[PDB]
Amino acid sequence: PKLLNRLNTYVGSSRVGKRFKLAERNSTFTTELRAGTATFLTMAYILAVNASILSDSGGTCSVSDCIPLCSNPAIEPSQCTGPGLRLIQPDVSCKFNPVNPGYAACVEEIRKDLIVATVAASLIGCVIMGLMANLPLALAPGMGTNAYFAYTVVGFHGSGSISYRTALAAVFIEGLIFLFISAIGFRAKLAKLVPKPVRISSSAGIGLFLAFIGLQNNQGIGLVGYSPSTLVTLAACPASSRISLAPVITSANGTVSLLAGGSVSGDIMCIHGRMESPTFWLGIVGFVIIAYCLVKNVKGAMIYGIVFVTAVSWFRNTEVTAFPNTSAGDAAHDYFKKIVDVHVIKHTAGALSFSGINKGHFWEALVTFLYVDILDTTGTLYSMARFAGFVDEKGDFAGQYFAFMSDASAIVIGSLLGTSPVTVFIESSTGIREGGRTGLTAITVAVYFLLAMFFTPLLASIPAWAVGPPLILVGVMMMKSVTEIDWEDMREAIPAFVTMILMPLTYSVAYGLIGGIGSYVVLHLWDWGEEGLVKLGFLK
Amino acid sequence: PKLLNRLNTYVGSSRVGKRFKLAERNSTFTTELRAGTATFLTMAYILAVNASILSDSGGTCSVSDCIPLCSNPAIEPSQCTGPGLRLIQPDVSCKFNPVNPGYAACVEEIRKDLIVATVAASLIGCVIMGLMANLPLALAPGMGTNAYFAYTVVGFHGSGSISYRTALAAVFIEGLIFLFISAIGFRAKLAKLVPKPVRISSSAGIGLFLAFIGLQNNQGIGLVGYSPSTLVTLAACPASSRISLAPVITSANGTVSLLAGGSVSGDIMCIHGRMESPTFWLGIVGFVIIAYCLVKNVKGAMIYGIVFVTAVSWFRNTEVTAFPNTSAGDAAHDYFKKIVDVHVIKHTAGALSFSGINKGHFWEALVTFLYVDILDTTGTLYSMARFAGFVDEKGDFAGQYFAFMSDASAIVIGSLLGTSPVTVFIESSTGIREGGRTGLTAITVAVYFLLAMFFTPLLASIPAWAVGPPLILVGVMMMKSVTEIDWEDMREAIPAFVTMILMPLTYSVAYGLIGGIGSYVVLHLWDWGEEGLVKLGFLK
Ligand SMILES: *[C@@H]1O[C@H](CO)[C@@H](O[C@@H]2O[C@H](CO)[C@@H](O)[C@H](O)[C@H]2NC(C)=O)[C@H](O)[C@H]1NC(C)=O
Ligand SMILES: *[C@@H]1O[C@H](CO)[C@@H](O[C@@H]2O[C@H](CO)[C@@H](O)[C@H](O)[C@H]2NC(C)=O)[C@H](O)[C@H]1NC(C)=O
Ligand SMILES: c1ccc(CNc2ncnc3[nH]cnc23)cc1
Ligand SMILES: c1ccc(CNc2ncnc3[nH]cnc23)cc1
C-alpha cells in the first residue's frame, strides 16, 4: 500500500502504540510526529528568548569575577605598572555601565549555560508529560515568568533584592508547593482564591510588561528611552548618540555635582538622531515579518523573524552587527564560528541557595511564581484539554492529575538546572490542531529540543533587537484576555486596570498583582461588610 | 400646586420655553436645572485637573522671567555684592530643577490664568451649544487632549518642540479646520479615513497615558519613579528621599563626569523609603473615595475625592501640605486665604503665535488635535444623541450640524483664551440620564461654571496628589473601549496593541497614533495588493 501507512499500522499495533493509546485516540505515528514538529516550530523562539532574558539577569557570579582595571584604559592591567598608575579594585558598580570585562565574560558563559539549561528543562518536561501524563503538550521555560525572574526578582545584572541562587531556590520551593497542592487536590481552592478581575487581567498586565521589555535597549529594539521631564520618550537613536545618567545633588542656585556611589545607568538617554537607529529598524523589519507570519497562520512566525534579524546581524562590519569590533565581540564571533558545540552547564546547574528564605522579598517572589504558575497552568492545561476533546461532562480530562504533577516536576527540574519556572505552552495547541493526541507529540518536541542542543553557538549570538519583536508580539497575544473584563463595572474595571497598568509601570508582576488584589479587597470591603451584617441579621 | 409646578408651567408656555422646545421634549424647567446640576457635579473635576495639567506646560513665559540668582543661596540677589560674589544670568536650565523662583512665579500666575480660561471656555462652549444647537451637552477642555497639549506638544515647562503660543495657534487652526469640514459635511469621510483598530484603541491608549501621568511625581501621586536598569520602578518615597539625574560620560575604566549643559531632571529617583510618602497615601485615599463614589453611582465622585485630598493638604505644617514653608508656599497660602477673587487673564489670553506653522512638529500636533477631536466629538455627540432619544432611523439627531459647529467654535474660543481643545463631555450623559433634553441644561452648566469663577484661589491650591487619582480613574473609564477589538485577529490586534502601548511608553498620543496607523498600513499591504491585482484580473 504505502510505506508511511505500513509504519503507522506497525507502530499503532505495537506495545508502545498501545502504551500511548494511539488507536484509542485516532492517530498513530505520523500525525504525532507532525504535531510535534508543528509545536516545536511554533515554540522554537523560546530557545533564544529565554536564554537572552535570563542572561540579562547576570547569572550566578558576583563582583568576584570582575577583573581589576588600570587607571587609564590605554594600558592593559598586566602592564599597569608605572608612576601615578594603579589598579582599581572592582566594586558593585563593576556589574553596571561601564560593565567590567570580567562580568561580561560571566554573562556570556552564563548565557551559554542558560541556553543549555532551557533546552534540557524543556526536554525533560516534555518527556515527563509525554510519558507520565500521556498528553500532546510541550513544556518549556515560562515566557511570562522569564522576565519577572530576570528583571524583577533578580534584576538586571543582579540589581534586584534577591540573588540569582536565592531566586532559583524560590522557584524550586514553588515547584514543590505546586506539586504538593496538585497532589492533594487543593489547587482549585487557591485558583478560586484570586479575584476574578485580577486573574483575568494579570495575563494582559504581563503582556504589557513583556512588550515594554521589548521596547527597551538592553532588552529589545529600543524606541523607549529616558526623559528628564517625562521619564519615557521616543528612543531608537544610534548607540553613538545615547548617554548614561548619574544621581546628582541640586541646590538653590543651580550647582549640581555627582553623587558618590551613584548607580549609573546604561546608555538610555538619546541626545539626538531619534528614530535613526539601524538596529531599531532591523527589529522593526523582524516585527513585520513575524506579524505577517502570524496573520498568514504560518507556523514558526517568531522563529522566522528572529532568524532573519539574527542572520542580518551576523555580518561583522555593519551598524547592526552582533559581533562588534571589540574583545567581547571577537570572542562572541569566535564562539559563533563553530556552528555546533556540546556545551556543559558549569555555573547555573545546581546553583540553589536557601540563604534568603527569611527575607520577605524571597517569599514575595515565591508567591508570585506560585500563583502565576497555578492560574496559567490550570487555564492552559484545561484549554488544551478542551481543544483536544479530552474534557468530559464533569470537566476532567483523565490525565489532568499527572499533567499537573508533570508540570510541577518540570518546574523543580528547571530550577535545579538554573532556569525560571517551566510551564505548558499554549503553542501546544498547534500540535493539537495538527492531530496530536498522545504523548508521542511531547516526545517528538523533546527530540527536537535535543537537536536544539549542539547549536548553542548559533543561539548564543542573538542580539537584543532580535529578541525584541518576539517580546512585543507575545505581549500582543497575551493582551487578548482583556475582553473578559466587564469594563462597565468599576468594582471589576478598577482592579483589572490597576493590575494591567502596574506590571509595566512599576515594572514588576508581583507589584501589579498586589495592587490589583488590594484594590479589589478595598473596593469590596463595603459589600462584604454589608453582606456580613445581613447574615448576622442587622440588615434586611 | 407646588411652586415648582407653577414655575414649570410658566416657563414651558413662555417664549423662551418654546424657543428651547421644552414642551415638545417632555421637560420644562426643573428637569433642565437638575440635569445641569448633575452634569456640573460629574464634570467639576475639570476645573482643577485642566488647570493643573496646563500649568505644568509652563505657560507663555520663557527664561525672560527667570530672575538672576546669587552665587550662594544664603545671599539674596539684591545683596549679591562682594568679593568673589556674582549674579548668575538665567538660561534654559532655569526652567527646570532647580526651578528658578521667577519661573515658579510664572507658573503660579499662569495657573490662575488657566483656571479662569478653563472656566470661561467651558462657559462659552456650553452657552453656544445650548443656544445654537439646543442640546443638553456640556463642553469643557478636553481631558484627553489636555495632557497631550501640556506634556507632549509643549512639554513640561516648555521642554517640547513647540512653544505654548505656537501650540495655541495649532489648536486655533485645528478648530477652524474642524469647523470647516463639519460645515461642508466632509467630517464623516475623514472619520472613516482612520483604521478601525487604531480608532478603537486610541481611547484606551490615551487612558493609559493619563493613568501613567497620574502615577508620576510632578503630575500625580507618584508610585512610578526612575530606575537606572529598568527606567521605571516603585516610587512613592518621601520627597526628602528623592534625587535628580544628570547626563554623564562613561569610559573603559570607570570614570564618570557630568555633561555640561545637561538637562537635569526632577526629583524622580528614590534612594530609600519606598511606599512611605504620606502624599502617595493621601492620593490613594482620594483614589479610594472616588472609586467607591463611582461604584455607588454617586455623582461628583472625582470632585469629592479631589476636595477631600485638597482639604487635607490645605493644613500648613504637615508632610502633605499644599503650602510648604517657603516663599512660594507662603505666596500660595496668601492667595488661598482670600476665598474668592475675580482673576483676569493677563498672559494666556490672545497668546497665539503663528511662527511655527512651517515646522513639522506644529503640523503633527495640529493633525493629532484634529483627528482626536473628530473621532472623539463624533463618537460622544452621537452617543449622547442615542442616549437622549434624539436619533432617527437615518441616524441624524436634528441639531448635529450646529452641534459640531458649536464644538469647533468652542475649540477656537478656548484656543484664544489659552487652553487645550474643548470638547463635549461624556459626563453630559448624567444630565441626559436626569431628564435634560433641551439647551437649558447647557445654560445651567454654564451658570455653574460662571459660579466656578470667584473661587480661583481655592482651585489654584490643588496639589498633584489631588489631580492624581482623577487622572488614573479617567484612564480607567477610557479603557472600556478595548472590548471592541477582535484580539483574536492579529491583523487587527497588532495595530490596536501598538496604539495602546505607544501612547504611555513613548508618552505621546501622536506617536501612538502614527505607530498604530503605520502598523495597520504595513500589515494590509499584502491584502491591498492582492485585492488590487484581483480587481485588475491577474488573480481569481
Ligand atoms: C579613567 O580614564 C580617564 C581617561 O579618559 C581618566 O580621566 C581623567 O579625569 C578627567 C576625565 O578625562 C580629566 O580631567 C583627567 O585629565 C583625566 N586624566 C587623564 C590622565 O587623562 C580617569 O581619571 C580614569 N579613572 C580614574 C579613576 O582615574
Ligand atoms: C551654589 O551654592 C552652593 C552652596 O551649597 C555653593 O557651594 C558649593 O558646593 C559644592 C558642593 O555642593 C562644592 O563643590 C563647591 O566647592 C561649593 N562652592 C563654594 C564656593 O564653596 C556653590 O559654589 C554655588 N555654585 C555657584 C555656581 O554659585
Ligand atoms: C500569564 C500568562 C502566561 C504566562 C507565561 N506562561 C505561558 N503559558 C502558556 N503558554 C505560554 N507560552 C509562553 N509562555 C507561556 C504567565 C502568566
Ligand atoms: C479619546 C477619548 C477622549 C478624549 C477626551 N475628550 C473627551 N470626550 C468625551 N468626554 C470627555 N470627558 C473628558 N474628556 C472627554 C480624547 C480622545
* DSSP codes, B241-275: GEEEEEEEE--SSS--EEPTT-----S-EE-S-TT
> B246 lies in a domain?
no
Q: Which residues contact B148 (CB under 8 A, 6 or more apart)?
A: B206, B209, B368, B369, B372, B420, B508, B509, B510
> B408 lies in a domain?
yes
Grid cell digits, residue A121: 528543562
Which of A151, A157, A248 is the closest to B264 by Cβ? A248
In A252-281, the residues whose Cβ lies within 8 Å of chain B are 252-254, 256-259, 263-269, 271
- Provide the residue type at A352 as one letter: L
Residues with CB under 6 A from ligand 2: A 251, 253, 255, 257; B 71-73
> B8 lies in a domain?
no
Long-range contacts of A45-48 (CB under 8 A, 24+ apart): A45/A302, A45/A303, A45/A306, A45/A470, A46/A118, A46/A122, A46/A140, A46/A141, A46/A143, A46/A425, A47/A115, A47/A118, A47/A119, A47/A449, A47/A452, A47/A459, A48/A306, A48/A310, A48/A459, A48/A462, A48/A466, A48/A467, A48/A470
Q: What is the DSSP letter of A247?
A: E
Q: Which residues contact A445 (CB under 8 A, 6 or more apart)?
A: A36, A39, A40, A43, A122, A126, A138, A431
How many angstroms is it from B267 CA to the middle of ligand 2? 20
Please tell me the distance from the alpha carbon of residue A172 to that of residue A194, in angstroms, as a whole number.
22
Distance from CA of A9 to the nearest CA of B (A): 38
How many angstroms is it from B177 CA to the middle of ligand 4? 19
Best residue of B71, B72, B151, B229 to probe chain A, by most A CBs closer than 10 Å? B229
> B12 lies in a domain?
no
Which of A93, A230, A482 is the closest to B254 by Cβ? A93
Task: Name the residue in chain A with its Cα closest to that of B524.
Answer: A292
| Domain total of chain B | 1
Please tell me the distance from the alpha carbon of residue A394 to that of residue B186, in angstroms, as a whole number.
58
Distance from CA of A451 to the nearest CA of B (A): 31
Which of A159, A246, A490 is the closest to B248 by Cβ? A246
Secondary structure element (H or E) that encloses residue A242, with its range: strand A242-249
Using DSSP's 3-state secondary structure scheme, residue A269 falls into: strand
Which of A229, A251, A493 is the closest to B265 by Cβ? A229
Q: Is the dihedral of CA A404, A408, A410, A411 positive or negative?
A: positive
For atom 16 of ligand 3, the residue with the nearest CA is A144
> B41 lies in a domain?
yes
Decide: B104 and B328 in contact? Cβ < 8 Å: yes
Please tell me the distance from the alpha carbon of residue B520 to that of residue B513, in angstroms, as a whole number.
10
Tell me: cis bond preceding A73? Omega within 30 of 0 counts. no
A164-183 and A400-417 are packed helices; what angle lies between their axes, rounded to 10 degrees?
A: 170
Decide: B71 and B85 in contact? Cβ < 8 Å: yes
- The candidate with the shortest Cα–Cα distance to B441, out of B104, B42, B2, B130, is B130
What number of helices (H) and strands (E) belong to chain A? 20, 9
Grid cell digits, residue B311: 482639604
Residue A487 forms contact with B (CB below 8 Å): yes
- Indicate yes or no: CB of A291 within 8 angstroms of CB of B526: no
Grid cell digits, residue A486: 466587564
**Which ligand approaches the C-alpha of residue B379 most closely?**
4
- Indicate yes or no: CB of B156 within 8 angstroms of CB of A211: no
Residue B231 forms contact with A (CB below 8 Å): yes
In B152-181, the residues whose Cβ lies within 8 Å of chain A are 155-157, 159
How much of chain A is helix, strand and coil, in % rounded to 5?
60, 5, 35
Grid cell digits, residue A295: 496573520
For residue B159, give Cα distances in angstroms to A290, A333, B59, B154, B517. 37, 43, 11, 6, 27
Please tell me the distance from the alpha carbon of residue B432 to that of residue A470, in angstroms, as a whole number.
47
Could you tell me if residue B155 is left (phi over 0), alpha (psi between -120 and 50 degrees) or otherwise beta?
A: left
List of chain B residues whose C-beta atoms are within 8 Å of the C-beta of residue A518: none
Please tell me the distance from the alpha carbon of residue A440 to that of residue B111, in angstroms, as a whole number.
70
Q: Which domain holds residue A480?
A: 3-77+86-222+277-536
Distance from CA of A519 to the nearest CA of B (A): 8
Widest distance between CA atoms in chain A: 92
Using DSSP's 3-state secondary structure scheme, residue A140 falls into: strand
Please tell me the distance from the alpha carbon of residue A446 to that of residue A452, in angstroms, as a whole number.
9
- The candidate with the shortest Cα–Cα distance to B120, out of B529, B413, B464, is B413
Atom of ligand 4 nearest to the CA of B143: 14
> B1 lies in a domain?
no
Task: Name the residue in chain A with its Cα closest to that of B218.
Answer: A229
Q: What does residue A229 show for φ and ψ, rounded to 5 degrees?
A: -90, -40
Using DSSP's 3-state secondary structure scheme, residue B227 falls into: coil
Decide: A238 and A232 in contact? Cβ < 8 Å: no
- Indicate yes or no: CB of B505 within 8 angstroms of CB of A224: yes
How many angstroms is it from B251 CA to the middle of ligand 1? 9
For residue B342, give Cα distances in angstroms to A427, B113, B418. 65, 11, 18
- Indicate yes or no: CB of A253 within 8 angstroms of CB of B159: no
**Which ligand approaches the C-alpha of residue B46 most closely?**
4
User: Does the beta carbon of A372 sit less than 6 angstroms from any atom of ligand 3?
Assistant: yes
> A326 lies in a domain?
yes
Task: Name the residue in chain A with its Cα closest to that of B522.
Answer: A288
> A265 lies in a domain?
no
Task: Name the residue in chain A with its Cα closest to that of B151.
Answer: A230
In B238-257, the residues whose Cβ lies within 8 Å of chain A are 243-254, 256-257
Candidate from B209, B376, B411 with most ligand 4 atoms within 8 A of CB, to mutate: B376
User: In residues, how long is chain B?
Assistant: 540
- Provide the residue type at A342 as one letter: V
- Indicate yes or no: CB of A265 within 8 angstroms of CB of B211: no
Task: Name the residue in chain A with its Cα closest to that of B252.
Answer: A73
Residue B44 forms contact with A (CB below 8 Å): no
Candidate from B72, B100, B244 with most ligand 2 atoms within 8 A of CB, to mutate: B72
Resolution in A: 2.7
Atom of ligand 2 nearest to the CA of B73: 2
Q: What does residue A137 show for φ and ψ, rounded to 5 degrees?
A: -110, 145
Which of B234, B268, B507 is the closest to A233 by Cβ? B507
Please tell me the distance from the alpha carbon of residue A122 to that of residue A119, in angstroms, as a whole number.
5
For residue A77, give Cα distances in angstroms to A95, A134, A434, B250, B274. 18, 58, 59, 19, 40
Task: Name the residue in chain B with its Cα closest to that of A510.
Answer: B234
Using DSSP's 3-state secondary structure scheme, residue A88 falls into: strand
- Indicate yes or no: CB of A228 within 8 angstroms of CB of B245: yes
